[PDB]
Amino acid sequence: AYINRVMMASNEQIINKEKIREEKQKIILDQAKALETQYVHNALKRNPVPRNYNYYQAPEKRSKHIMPSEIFDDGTFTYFGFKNITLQPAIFVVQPDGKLSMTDAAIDPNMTNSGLRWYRVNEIAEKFKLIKDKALVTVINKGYGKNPLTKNYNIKNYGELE
Amino acid sequence: IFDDGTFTYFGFKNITLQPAIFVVQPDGKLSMTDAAIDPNMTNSGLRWYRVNEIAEKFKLIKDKALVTVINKGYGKNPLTKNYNIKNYGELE
């Protein structure tokens, strides 16, 4: 009866406490990973703060089914707010020679302020045509260049880089 | 706008757009030069845009709007002679 080898089979309690050590290290590591990706996913699409409101509009003729309602910006993007009884125009940025420029745009699904349909464009300019085939309406930015940003890289100013 | 004797750093706002920069050749013609937005410089909250030449007139051209930059400090402070941008340079 050599019970001493059973006692020398207790060097894996060192292995036991070290695997509990690296396991709680693993749990705190991926818990910090999940926490920070929760934060950077929550504060990536949060909301934009508005920057200026000084927007006028001028419809030509029978542009009531195309007229925007509440328009503002954030210094980077311009948020148009339509009703739902209105249709969806083709938005255009007036180039400073007077010509037009088709820009990328999307209906923003996150914003539902005041029960509108929000539609952002990715430019800040002074005149915006909203054109369907005959009806159109021109939006005049009388707050152009009054409140810009200083300089940033991401939409919210908690930005990442590599 | 400033320079370092080798590169010329333009500093834009962000409400402005991004022109096509051009170096005026001394006959009066233009010359497209290589340029890049410098990501390291964020002085005064601007968009820095360096070109790789030192000249006297710089056109900044989009389709109808343009602006001419006049170097009234051209050739007043050059370098002596160097090989790299910072003067701790390597060679083989």
Residue numbers in the entry:
A (entry chain S): 349 to 510
B (entry chain R): 419 to 510
From the paper:
This helix extends from the top of the O-layer through the central chamber into the I-layer of the OMCC. The C-terminal portion of CagY is structurally similar to VirB10 and TraF homologs, and the C-terminal portion of CagX is structurally similar to VirB9 and TraO homologs. Both CagY and CagX are much larger in size than characterized VirB/Tra homologs, and correspondingly, CagX has a long α-helix that is absent in the structures of TraO or VirB9 (4, 5). The tips of these α-helices are presumed to be flexible, since the corresponding densities are not well defined in the higher resolution maps.
The H. pylori Cag T4SS is of particular interest because of its role in translocating CagA (a bacterial oncoprotein) into host cells, an important step in gastric cancer pathogenesis. Here we report the use of single particle cryo-EM to determine the structure of a transmembrane Cag T4SS complex extracted and purified from H. pylori. The structure can be divided into three major regions: the OMCC, a periplasmic ring complex (PRC), and a central stalk.
